[PDB]
Design a protein around this ligand. Structure first.
Ligand SMILES: O=C(/C=C/C=C/c1ccc2c(c1)OCO2)N1CCCCC1
Lengths: 252, 256
């Protein structure tokens, strides 16, 4: 029934808004046109001044302090994604261990999806969109830190060409969380059933919200491959840094 | 709005459950009496047989035991803390400062769940070490555990369940009065909302328990005192037992 699907689409849209302070639409505006624009970081000099103008909550060598900052924020996004997951109908009724398993394996995927919303070919919004860090400044970081972020830019550029909006992404992120193939799952059935319902919703959303965009649904599901590659790749990059107190415990 | 507060109570209960394998409810069901029956350790020979049956000098290896398990508890508390709304958004220095001071307070709160007047569950519930065996240990390990027993006896008379504790330990972590905090106010606003949640919880979950909220807040004094005696005990050991090792995660917590 179209109606239940639209209802679910709306429900997720409203929860995405409440959970994710910095939305795609707001980020878009920030990247385009002005009004008070954000502070730009494009060199060493500018980073330093940015510390003083954008009070960093992560600030307890440069390349590392930048890496720690991505850590602080992705820890914050986990909390946001966790809260959003609880609004997805059926999610809280699942086995608790499965809930934890879906969030653990799903959050990197969702982070890099939503980070795309904050990126363009030239850089990425930071600090709830009051900063902009350029792509080239990210690449110039001593190796191996130079290309931590290049892959995400490559992905976002391609991903952003689908022209999704927040209302589309709300459902897509839901579909990602409910992936029945995560390791260690105890009762895959209700996960897949909820995933099926979300997939039907996503399909109707895309067809309605983008009637002239041929097979968008398919193309969007195909991107879930590019996500998983960005993830295995990121994790390998972490293992390389790890080989070259309470703080640890926070960032396990 | 009591609805937002109940929502917050639910959220904290859910995370407590996800973060802490051995709950108060599970511990009590074990201490009552089954297939969940623990092995009891009450004497030296007894220690030895339980080594075989459960997962240096005696007194030390018991102390290293309590030390390994505090390391584990810190890891669990750290995970739980991040689920508390607003915690991870605070300045990182403050996050570290709140965990440093709040962690032992929570360890002794939660250890009460594992205790009764006669002893304490160990090894996730597989074992039970009697209070007397712990008292008899060569000094200064003799009454390392007595203070915690005295607290637990009094604390357990409040009859809290895990859903109450989830909020209470949230209130403990978010204390704006820790030394060296940078931005006391955001912490206090979080605490205020947690305190309101705790008050609605206690009133709803224990309607006949007069002023339980107050009595619970007063227990924060017994906690701070437990924390003080322990640290002094560690400094005795560091000079008696130059040969005994202390886990660095714990070391950082105590050092300051
Ligand atoms: O020496 C030990 C274990 C010692 C545990 C010791 C211990 C003491 C107080 C505690 C605690 C653990 O947890 C909370 O409070 N063994 C007996 C059990 C099997 C392994 C060896």
């Amino acid at each position: 029934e179209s109606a239940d699907l639209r209802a679910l689409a709306k429900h997720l849209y409203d929860s995405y808004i409440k959970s994710f302070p910095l939305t795609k639409a707001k980020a878009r505006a920030i990247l385009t046109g002005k009004d008070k624009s954000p502070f730009v970081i494009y060199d060493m000099n500018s980073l330093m001044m940015g510390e003083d103008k954008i009070k960093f909550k992560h600030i307890t060598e440069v390349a590392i302090r930048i890496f720690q900052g991505c850590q602080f924020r992705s820890v914050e996004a986990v909390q946001e994604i966790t809260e959003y997951a609880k609004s997805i109908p059926g999610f809280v009724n699942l086995d608790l261990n499965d809930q934890v398993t879906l969030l653990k394996y799903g959050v990197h995927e969702i982070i890099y999806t939503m980070l795309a919303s904050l990126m363009n070919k030239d850089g990425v919004l930071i600090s709830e969109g009051q900063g902009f860090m350029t792509r080239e400044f990210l690449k110039s970081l001593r190796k191996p830190f130079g290309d931590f972020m290049e892959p995400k830019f490559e992905f976002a550029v391609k991903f952003n060409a689908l022209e999704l909006d927040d209302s589309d992404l709300a459902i897509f992120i839901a579909v990602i969380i409910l992936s029945g193939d995560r390791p260690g799952l105890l009762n895959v059935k209700p996960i897949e059933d909820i995933q099926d319902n979300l997939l039907q919703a996503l399909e109707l959303q895309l067809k309605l919200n983008h009637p002239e965009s041929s097979q968008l649904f398919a193309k969007l599901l195909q991107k879930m491959t590019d996500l998983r590659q960005i993830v295995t790749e990121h994790v390998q990059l972490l293992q390389v840094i790890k080989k070259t107190p309470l703080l640890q415990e926070i960032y396990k």
